[PDB]
């Protein structure tokens, strides 16, 4: 109930929300059906429109008017945004030459530069270039301020997850808005764009920017706008708030536009009908900037122009139907469209079996346009699993396609209407969106590389002098956007220091069931090999310092001619293995006599070693090596690669992948990049939280042993950004690509896996591309500790994702 008999007189667009049953006058009151009876009359004036004309200049103030052109309007803060242009001979902001904003030029009484977030729904990244002729205000912001070529959204590339990520710095799995539609099995409640459940605060986790601000004494405008409030009124409202007394005036504001998304769905991303929405958004930006100029705030305020996601061509004829694959289609519930999420229709149906559903949806049609996954098997870069609102079965849909349950869902929602959609994998080029920063705190005429939207919350906090709530950004990685207010972090402290074991065990102390034909024998070279075991080549293979271990454990550094490792006594394998392969390196074979060779490591106790008998007995499990024997520097050095301390458990299906990577791709990358440094290792994430498992979280061991089975294998592949310098003699910035491969007992993910590995392995690896930061979370290791480069530059490097998309 709402007693709508209260009044909005003196309350239009009030900032504090008054509680039920009292009636509301805030910018969301319409969405709750809660506005006071006179809200439209008093707060949504439209009389005479949005622009001054020559005949209105110096008029007598008429309070019915939407905006004012009377002499008093500037002091009242309610002039039409073109008032000074029409009535005082001033220029529009867009017609003024760009001039660097070296310091904030703010009115007296401003404690900090305000921040205005100008958010646009469905604003695809390529609109900045492709629409530039029709968007002169936006183009001035972009060219004179700080811009990225694109900004990466979060998956799913839908509106509610992305706007909330922008607000919080959190992945959807952590903030809880995992889709525009959701079922929470604990609440037994459904969240939908239509209806009232979405207003319940229990859905919305983390701490959004407006709350972070308010808790730290920084006043915030209300970010949300009911759809019926015209954009001109949203801008005039912000400009009015900026005219409030110092003790009442907010420091942070958001504008939101439903365009160009609304038209994009109807017309496709580049339909000819899209020009007009882009023009109208640009006009709105011009109103804001002219309005700020009138208030002498255009060189005071920091402006962010930012999108939530892009827009792809999608039509209803490009729909896959689950009814063509499943006999049991009426026993499932599907969340459909540009992603799929499947659960049982009834929790009482004991016949429901996810394994059978997955198999029925796997590689069944030659050009099949979706791929099913258990959520823990999704690419780790999506960070889309650790929430009870995310169904176990997920369908990753190809760009340009939909999935639906039955055809009647698509023609009873007899043809269709729409030409655009979004939601796909967040590395897809059509899903990328925009970022521009303009103001005293941003840099001048500066391009920055693409970055992820999870990073922006920290920067918005920096811009307002706020301490960010705990989030998934890497604070510092966007310092290069800012003139001032940079955040200067310190590297994390190493928690566990390594042991450096020497030769401590005799061969006969080992009873591991291993064998090797290595009984083949010099003072010159005996000293030389001792030096290699003491670390004499470590400078070549450990180029950026050893990784730091950020948790309590027991591990050993092991040195070798061709590679260095940090060997875990607890997990009985390396945490990391580091090696450098020059451009001129030669690939060799595993010699016949060493095919099944595994050698005890006399530096490491039998008790802290793997054993070969476990692998013989485990009929499902084989092994591979972290440092590849194919890339040994010499036949004598190759023996090091068969140490038991370089062995890791691998399913035979996975060994196909790993062997191709090691034998073919590493050398290819070294040839292309002028040497590479590789750091490889295991990952254990049995609870799919994106974080390193403790020992007691491990669900699978090599049969009969205490050898834990990794859920994934990573590699970090680093070289010189200036590829005219070899990786091992690089003077400047670095270049990286990484992956986190799922350690699966089949290659069902790869529909062409019966073919030669040259036709499918690299496609797999691209799908499982990763940031170094992702590997850091999953391992508790901290990389790049010892470089010549600034720490903030290294943080940027660690957040890089190699996406493998064209320009």
Ligand X SMILES: *[C@@H]1O[C@H](CO)[C@@H](O[C@@H]2O[C@H](CO)[C@@H](O[C@@H]3O[C@H](CO[C@H]4O[C@H](CO)[C@@H](O)[C@H](O[C@H]5O[C@H](CO)[C@@H](O)[C@H](O)[C@@H]5O[C@H]5O[C@H](CO)[C@@H](O)[C@H](O)[C@@H]5O)[C@@H]4O)[C@@H](O)[C@H](O[C@H]4O[C@H](CO)[C@@H](O)[C@H](O)[C@@H]4O[C@H]4O[C@H](CO)[C@@H](O)[C@H](O)[C@@H]4O)[C@@H]3O)[C@H](O)[C@H]2NC(C)=O)[C@H](O)[C@H]1NC(C)=O
Ligand Y SMILES: Cc1nnn(Cc2cc(C(F)(F)F)ccc2CCC(=O)N2CCC(CCS(=O)(=O)c3ccc(S(=O)(=O)/N=C/N(C)C)cc3F)CC2)n1
Contact residues for Cl ion, defined by CB under 5 A: 653, 747
The answer to the question of whether 159 is labelled as a binding residue is: yes
Instruction: Extract the tokens encoding 232.
Output: 């001109």
Q: Is 611 in the site for Na ion (CB under 5 A)?
A: no
Q: Is 378 in the site for ligand X (CB under 6 A)?
A: no
Q: Are 512 and 599 in contact (CB under 8 A)?
A: no
Q: Beta strand 734-742 with 712-720: parallel, antiparallel or unpaired?
A: antiparallel
Select from Zn ion, ligand Y, ligand X, none the partner in contact with residue 198, using the beta carbon and a kind-dependent cut-off of 5 to 8 Å.
ligand Y
| Rounded CA Rg of the chain | 30
Instruction: Extract the tokens encoding 38.
Output: 């006179």
Q: Are 406 and 123 in contact (CB under 8 A)?
A: no
Q: Are 668 and 761 in contact (CB under 8 A)?
A: no
- x-or-dash string of contact with ligand Y, 272-311, rule CB under 6 A: ----------------------------------x-----
CA-to-CA dists, residue 34 to 12, 15, 200, 231, angstroms: 13, 15, 16, 21
Helix (H), strand (E) at residue 313: strand 312-313
User: Which residues have CB under 8 Å from 234's CB, separation 6+?
Assistant: 27, 225, 255, 256
Instruction: Extract the tokens encoding 186.
Output: 């604990």
Instruction: Extract the tokens encoding 335.
Output: 């969340």
Please say which residue, 124 or 663, places its beta carbon nearer to Ca ion: 124
- x-or-dash string of contact with Na ion, 742-781, rule CB under 5 A: -----x--x--x----------------------------
Quote the CA–CA distance of 393 and 217 in Å, as a whole number.
44
Catalytic site residue 159? yes
The answer to the question of whether 265 is labelled as a binding residue is: yes
Please say which residue, 159 or 441, places its beta carbon nearer to Ca ion: 159
Q: Binding to Zn ion (CB under 5 A): which residues in 475-504?
A: none
Please say which residue, 163 or 764, places its beta carbon nearer to Zn ion: 163
Select from Zn ion, ligand X, ligand Y, none the partner in contact with residue 261, using the beta carbon and a kind-dependent cut-off of 5 to 8 Å.
Zn ion
The stretch among 267-275, 381-389, 564-572, 712-720 that binds ligand X (CB under 6 A) is: 381-389
The position carrying tokens 């043809």 is: 415
SS3 label, residue 164: helix
CB of 159 to Zn ion, least distance (A): 6
Q: Beta strand 446-447 with 146-147: parallel, antiparallel or unpaired?
A: parallel
Cis peptide before 260 (omega within 30 of 0): yes
Q: Is 157 in the site for ligand Y (CB under 6 A)?
A: no
Q: Binding to Ca ion (CB under 5 A): which residues in 659-688?
A: 685, 687
Please say which residue, 308 or 793, places its beta carbon nearer to Ca ion: 308
User: Which residues have CB under 8 Å from 12's CB, separation 6+?
Assistant: 25, 39, 42, 43
The answer to the question of whether 777 is labelled as a binding residue is: no
Dihedral pair phi/psi, residue 447, rounded to 5°: -95, 140
Q: After which residues is the chain broken (C to N over 2.5 A)?
A: 413, 521
Q: Is 697 in the site for ligand X (CB under 6 A)?
A: no
Q: Is 123 in the site for ligand Y (CB under 6 A)?
A: no
Quote the CA–CA distance of 633 and 636 in Å, as a whole number.
8
Q: Is 157 in the site for Ca ion (CB under 5 A)?
A: no
Quote the CA–CA distance of 503 and 526 in Å, as a whole number.
14
Helix (H), strand (E) at residue 282: helix 275-294
Q: Is 254 in the site for ligand Y (CB under 6 A)?
A: yes
Q: Is 213 in the site for ligand Y (CB under 6 A)?
A: no
CB of 422 to Ca ion, least distance (A): 7
Select from ligand X, Ca ion, Zn ion, none the partner in contact with residue 239, using the beta carbon and a kind-dependent cut-off of 5 to 8 Å.
none
Instruction: List residues forming the annotated binding site for 1-tetradecanoyl-sn-glycerol 3-phosphate.
Output: 159, 180, 261, 422
Binding-site sequence positions for Zn(2+)? 121, 159, 261, 265, 308-309, 422
Catalog residues that contact Zn ion under the rule CB under 5 A: 261
Cite the annotated binding site by residue number. Answer: 121, 159, 180, 261, 265, 308-309, 422, 685, 687, 689, 691, 693
Residues placed in the known binding site for 1-hexadecanoyl-sn-glycero-3-phosphate: 159, 180, 261, 422
Catalytic residues, which ones? 159
Q: Which residues bind ligand Y (CB under 6 A)?
A: 28, 31, 117, 119, 160, 163-164, 166-167, 198-199, 201, 204, 208, 223-225, 254, 256, 306
Give me the residues that bind Ca ion (CB under 5 A), please: 121, 159, 261, 308, 685, 687, 689, 691, 693
């Amino acid at each position: 109930w709402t007693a709508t008999s209260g009044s909005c007189k003196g309350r239009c667009f009030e900032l504090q929300e008054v509680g039920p049953p009292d009636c509301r006058c805030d910018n969301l009151c319409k969405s709750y059906s809660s506005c006071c009876h006179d809200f439209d009359e008093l707060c949504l004036k439209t009389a005479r429109g949005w622009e001054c004309t020559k005949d209105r200049c110096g008029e007598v103030r008429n309070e019915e008017n939407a905006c004012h052109c009377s002499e008093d309007c500037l002091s009242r803060g309610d002039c039409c945004t073109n008032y000074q242009v029409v009535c005082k001979g001033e220029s529009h902001w867009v017609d003024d030459d760009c001039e660097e904003i070296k310091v904030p030029e703010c009115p007296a009484g401003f404690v900090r530069p305000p921040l205005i977030i100008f958010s646009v729904d469905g604003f695809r990244a390529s609109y900045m270039k492709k629409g530039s002729k029709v968007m002169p205000n936006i183009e001035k912001l972009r060219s004179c301020g700080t811009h990225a070529p694109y900004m990466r959204p979060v998956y799913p590339t839908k509106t509610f997850p992305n706007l909330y990520t922008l607000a919080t710095g959190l992945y959807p799995e952590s903030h809880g808005i995992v889709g525009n539609s959701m079922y929470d099995p604990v609440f037994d409640a459904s969240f939908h764009l239509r209806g009232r459940e979405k207003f319940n605060h229990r859905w919305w986790g983390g701490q959004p920017l407006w709350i972070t601000a308010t808790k730290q004494g920084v006043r915030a405008g209300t970010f949300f706008w009911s759809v019926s409030i015209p954009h001109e009124r949203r801008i005039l409202t912000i400009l009015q708030w900026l005219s409030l007394p110092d003790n009442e005036r907010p420091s942070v504001y958001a504008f939101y536009s439903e365009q160009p998304d609304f038209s994009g769905h109807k017309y496709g991303p580049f339909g000819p009908e899209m020009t007009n929405p882009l023009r109208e958004i640009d006009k709105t930006v011009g109103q804001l900037m002219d309005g700020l100029k009138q208030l002498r705030l255009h060189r005071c305020v920091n402006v962010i122009f930012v999108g939530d996601h892009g827009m792809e061509d999608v039509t209803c004829d490009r729909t896959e139907f689950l009814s063509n694959y499943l006999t049991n289609v009426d026993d499932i519930t599907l969340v459909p469209g540009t992603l799929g999420r499947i659960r049982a229709k009834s929790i009482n149906n004991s016949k429901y079996d996810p394994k059978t559903i997955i198999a029925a949806l796997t590689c069944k049609k030659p050009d099949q346009h979706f791929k099913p996954y258990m959520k823990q098997h999704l690419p780790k870069r999506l960070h889309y699993a650790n929430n009870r609102r995310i169904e176990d079965i997920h369908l990753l849909v190809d760009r340009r396609w939909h999935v639906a349950r039955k055809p009647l869902d698509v023609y009873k929602k007899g043809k269709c209407f729409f030409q655009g959609d979004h939601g796909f994998d967040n590395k897809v080029n059509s899903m990328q969106t925009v970022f521009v920063g303009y103001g005293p705190t941003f840099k001048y005429r500066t391009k920055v590389p693409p970055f992820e939207n999870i990073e922006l919350y920290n920067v918005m906090c920096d811009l307002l002098g706020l301490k960010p709530a705990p989030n998934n950004g890497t604070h510092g990685s966007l310092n290069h956007l800012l003139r001032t207010n940079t955040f200067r972090p310190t590297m994390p402290d190493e928690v566990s220091r390594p042991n450096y074991p020497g030769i401590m065990y005799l061969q006969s102390e080992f009873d591991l069931g291993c064998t090797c034909d290595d009984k083949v024998e010099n003072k010159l070279e005996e000293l030389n090999k001792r030096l290699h075991t003491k670390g004499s080549t470590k400078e070549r293979h450990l180029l950026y310092g050893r990784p730091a271990v950020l948790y309590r454990t027991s591990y050993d550094i092991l040195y070798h001619t061709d590679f260095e490792s940090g060997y875990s006594e607890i997990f009985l394998m390396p945490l990391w293995t580091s090696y450098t392969i020059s451009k001129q390196a030669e690939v060799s074979s595993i010699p016949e006599h060493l095919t099944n060779c595994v050698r005890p490591d006399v530096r490491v106790s039998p008790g802290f070693s793997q054993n070969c008998l476990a692998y013989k007995n485990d009929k499902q499990m084989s092994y591979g090596f972290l440092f590849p024997p194919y890339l040994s520097s010499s036949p004598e050095a190759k023996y090091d690669a068969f140490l038991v301390t370089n062995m890791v458990p691998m399913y035979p299906a996975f060994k196909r992948v790993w062997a191709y990577f090691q034998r073919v791709l590493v050398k290819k990358y070294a040839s292309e990049r002028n040497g590479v440094n590789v750091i490889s290792g295991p990952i254990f994430d049995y609870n799919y939280d994106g974080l390193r498992d403790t020992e007691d979280e491990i669900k699978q061991y090599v049969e009969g042993s205490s050898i834990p089975v990794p859920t994934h294998y990573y590699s970090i592949i680093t070289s010189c950004l200036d590829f005219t310098q070899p990786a091992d003699k690089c003077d400047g910035p670095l270049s990286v690509s990484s992956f986190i491969l799922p350690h699966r007992p089949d290659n069902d993910e790869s529909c062409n896996s019966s073919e030669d590995e040259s036709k499918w392995v690299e496609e797999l690896m691209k799908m499982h591309t990763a940031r170094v930061r992702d590997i850091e979370h999953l391992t508790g290791l901290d990389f790049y500790r010892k470089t010549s480069r600034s720490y903030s530059e290294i943080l940027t490097l660690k957040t890089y994702l190699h996406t493998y998309e064209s320009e």
